């Protein structure tokens, strides 16, 4: 079924959620300069980009699987659009996890 795909991309977001939690806990606490803050933000985006290519690599595999199954071609098309929407949602939340990892005015750091 497509439930395999829905959980596949949902598994990536949970991993990103755990990975970004440990990322935040290891950021320097206290009064930081400002150059240091963007250094934190580029790493959060670098970590989000790595988690996102795992999503796309998985998206390409299932698409190859969808086209190669003995189903009606109009059923290839909609399944390809739903699995694309699953991966798009996964990439959006991963981006949201990276942004909120360096959110201003939390307990962590300040200027």
């Amino acid at each position: 079924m497509r439930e395999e795909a829905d959980e596949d991309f949902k598994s990536f977001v949970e991993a990103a959620k755990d990975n970004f939690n440990k990322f935040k806990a290891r950021l320097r606490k206290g009064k930081i300069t400002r150059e240091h803050r963007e250094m934190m933000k580029k790493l959060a985006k670098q970590n989000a980009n790595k988690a996102k290519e795992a999503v796309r690599k998985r998206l390409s595999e299932l698409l190859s699987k969808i086209n190669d199954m003995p189903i009606t071609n109009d059923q290839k098309k909609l399944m390809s659009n739903q699995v694309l929407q699953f991966a798009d949602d996964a990439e959006a939340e991963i981006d949201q996890l990276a942004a909120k990892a360096t959110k201003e005015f939390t307990g962590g750091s300040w200027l």
Partner: antibody
Amino acid sequence: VQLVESGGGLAKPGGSLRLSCAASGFTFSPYWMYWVRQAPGKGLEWVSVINSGGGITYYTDSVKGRFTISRENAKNTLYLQMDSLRPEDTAVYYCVRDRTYYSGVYYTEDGLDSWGQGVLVTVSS
Amino acid sequence: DIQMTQSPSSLSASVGDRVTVTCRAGQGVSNYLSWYQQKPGKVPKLLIYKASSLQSGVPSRFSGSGSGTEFTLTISSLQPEDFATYYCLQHNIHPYSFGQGTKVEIKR
């Protein structure tokens, strides 16, 4: 963006031939591939199908067990091993590409759009 | 494989006439019906895919219609070079299957 076919010709009843189909100019891996034959003066009809290097293969009733459609995506070549040839196997054989693939952001569904020049298989003693 | 039933087996028509070729599928094929033109001793040429989509470079006088199990190729104004056998093809589900072919002859 052509397909060239090899093999075929004259073969005695019960003998074996095998058709090659070298693809070029495009992406051979993701598309389903067809072998279509046309007996002299008669209509078109599919004979064998295969996926993107997968294990799903179709064969028409006239050819079960005898012919085996092989495929690899490295050399970009399609195959049709033809064993136990019978007088009604006389036809022009074409290898065709199904330009159908769905990627979500983009898709094509032209169907069987690119054909080989054809090859004549003659079965006679 | 779905069984395609095309009619007529052959027909004759004058230059400038409107020609109609009918194709019928055993099961529903939705929008995935193709029309091919084959002239003597030549590779079949895809004219129309998706029943009503014209391939690149195909003359405008060719047009298809229908969806479900009833389809119709239409040549609005027959030309001398339109002499050929026309086949319908469902590309909805593998294996794709052809019709019997319609042999079009020119009256002059």
